[PDB]
Amino acid sequence: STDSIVKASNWRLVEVGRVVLIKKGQSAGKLAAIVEIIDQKKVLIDGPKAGVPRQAINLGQVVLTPLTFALPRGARTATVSKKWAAAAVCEKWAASSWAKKIAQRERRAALTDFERFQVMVLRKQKRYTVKKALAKA
């Protein structure tokens, strides 16, 4: 065909309204959103839903999300929480495979040996079904 073809790296851009995960620090396991940029490696964030205070940070302690919402620059924390709720971004985050695996391993940590034996027996029964299931087909 005549159609020119290219792949372009679809990167998570650093921007305003961009929601982020905290990797390190006291707010590990939390989410927040950017307000403003300072340099290549420094930004300003707030996690009022998550309960993070408005603050600057280096980006090494943080990973971007694939998610993002609409937000003007310099938004104070109240407006930030407002737009966060309006966009319903934590809801959307919960539907991630990412958050699900996270809460999964959180459970896996929280398990009790009784529950682990339960898990074992359940795996065994599931497997007994699945073997003869994947015998005929």
Partner 1 sequence: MKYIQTEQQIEVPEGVTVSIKSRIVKVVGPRGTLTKNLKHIDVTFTKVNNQLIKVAVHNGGRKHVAALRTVKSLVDNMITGVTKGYKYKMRYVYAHFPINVNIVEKDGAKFIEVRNFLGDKKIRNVPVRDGVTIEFSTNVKDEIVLSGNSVEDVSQNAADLQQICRVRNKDIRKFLDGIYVSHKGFITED
Partner 2 sequence: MAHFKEYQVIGRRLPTESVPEPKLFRMRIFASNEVIAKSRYWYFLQKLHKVKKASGEIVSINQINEAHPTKVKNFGVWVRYDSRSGTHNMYKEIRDVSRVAAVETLYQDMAARHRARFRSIHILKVAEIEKTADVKRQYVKQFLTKDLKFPLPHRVQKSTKTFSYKRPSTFY
Partner 3 sequence: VEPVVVIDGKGHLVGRLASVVAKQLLNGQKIVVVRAEELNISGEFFRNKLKYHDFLRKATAFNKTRGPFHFRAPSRIFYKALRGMVSHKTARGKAALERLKVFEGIPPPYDKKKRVVVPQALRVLRLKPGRKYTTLGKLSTSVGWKYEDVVAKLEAKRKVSSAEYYAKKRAFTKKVASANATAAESDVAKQLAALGY
Partner RNA sequence: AGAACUGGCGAUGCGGGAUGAACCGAACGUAGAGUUAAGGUGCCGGAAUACACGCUCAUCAGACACCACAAAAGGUGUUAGUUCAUCUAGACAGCCGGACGGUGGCCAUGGAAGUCGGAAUCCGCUAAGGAGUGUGUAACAACUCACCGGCCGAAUGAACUA
Partner RNA sequence: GCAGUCAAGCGUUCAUAGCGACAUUGCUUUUUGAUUCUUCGAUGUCGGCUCUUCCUAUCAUACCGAAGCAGAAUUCGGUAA
Residues that bind partner 3 (CB under 8 A): 103-108, 110-111, 115, 118-119, 122-123, 125-126, 129-130, 133-134, 137
C-beta of 55 vs 104, nearer to partner 2: 55
Task: Quickly count: other Cβ atoms within 10 Å of residue 119's Cβ.
Answer: 12
Q: Is 113 in the site for RNA (CB under 7 A)?
A: no
Q: Which residues contact 35 (CB under 8 A, 6 or more apart)?
A: 16, 44, 45, 46, 54, 71, 73, 74, 75, 80
Q: Binding to RNA (CB under 7 A): which residues in 1-40?
A: 39-40
C-beta of 2 vs 26, nearer to partner 1: 2
User: How large is the greatest C-alpha to C-alpha distance in the chain, in angstroms?
Assistant: 64
Residue 86 contacts which entry, RNA, partner 1, partner 3, none (Cβ below 5-8 A, type-dependent):
none
C-beta of 42 vs 105, nearer to partner 3: 105
- Residue 32 burial by CB count (10 A; 0-12/13-18/19+): exposed, middle or buried? buried
Q: Which residues contact 98 (CB under 8 A, 6 or more apart)?
A: none
Residue 97 contacts which entry, RNA, partner 1, partner 3, none (Cβ below 5-8 A, type-dependent):
none
Residue 42 contacts which entry, partner 1, partner 2, partner 3, none (Cβ below 5-8 A, type-dependent):
partner 2
Q: Is 58 in the site for RNA (CB under 7 A)?
A: yes
Per the CB < 8 A criterion, the answer to whether 81 and 48 are in contact is yes
Rounded to whole angstroms, the Cα distance separating 31 from 33 reads 7
- Considering the complex, what minimum distance in angstroms separates the CB of residue 112 from partner 2? 25
